[PDB]
Amino acid sequence: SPTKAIVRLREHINLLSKKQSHLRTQITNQENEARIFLTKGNKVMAKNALKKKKTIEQLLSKVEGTMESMEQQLFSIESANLNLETMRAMQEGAKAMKTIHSGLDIDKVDETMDEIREQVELGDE
């Protein structure tokens, strides 16, 4: 069902937002480790901590892209559903209009209408 897909997409996005928060924390942690290494005079290990920070930032970007893709999919589904709702309302409205336009069991107005239409249109060819 559309509802099923929608709730699952939201659940997935929620989890990815938690992964986002976790990765941001890990990025700050790498910065922290780098500063401490520099205060120790170990530029090699500071650089190594910042290389890892860069890798984590790359993964954070991929998490963000995954979330965006799911949000777009969710929007598409919600939009399609509203379109279906409009379509069903229009078809039931059209049914009601047909019933009203055949509302006369008395007497032969529709056929006369069509006859006069064609007379009026006869000037066109």
Numbering used by the authors: 18 to 142
Paper excerpt:
By selectively removing its autoinhibitory C-terminus, we determine the first crystal structure of the Snf7 core domain in the active conformation at 1.6 Å resolution. Surprisingly, rather than adopting a rigid four-helix coiled-coil, the core domain undergoes a large-scale conformational rearrangement to extend into a highly elongated structure. This conformational change not only extends a cationic membrane-binding surface, but also exposes hydrophobic and electrostatic protein interacting surfaces for polymerization. Comparison of our Snf7core crystal structures we determined revealed two distinct conformations. Although both structures exhibit an open conformation, we noted two different orientations of α4 with respect to the α1/2 hairpin. In open conformation A, α4 extends in the protofilament plane, whereas in open conformation B, α4 is positioned perpendicular to the protofilament plane. Superimposing the two conformations revealed that α4 can rotate by at least ~90° along the axis of the α2/3 helix.
The endosomal sorting complexes required for transport (ESCRTs) are membrane remodeling machinery that mediate diverse fundamental cellular processes, including the biogenesis of multivesicular body (MVB) during receptor down-regulation, enveloped virus budding, cytokinesis, plasma membrane repair, nuclear pore complex assembly, and nuclear envelope reformation. Vps20 nucleates the homo-oligomerization of the most abundant ESCRT-III subunit, Snf7, which then recruits Vps24 and Vps2. We then crystallized and solved X-ray crystal structures of Snf7core in two conformations at 1.6 Å and 2.4 Å resolutions, respectively.
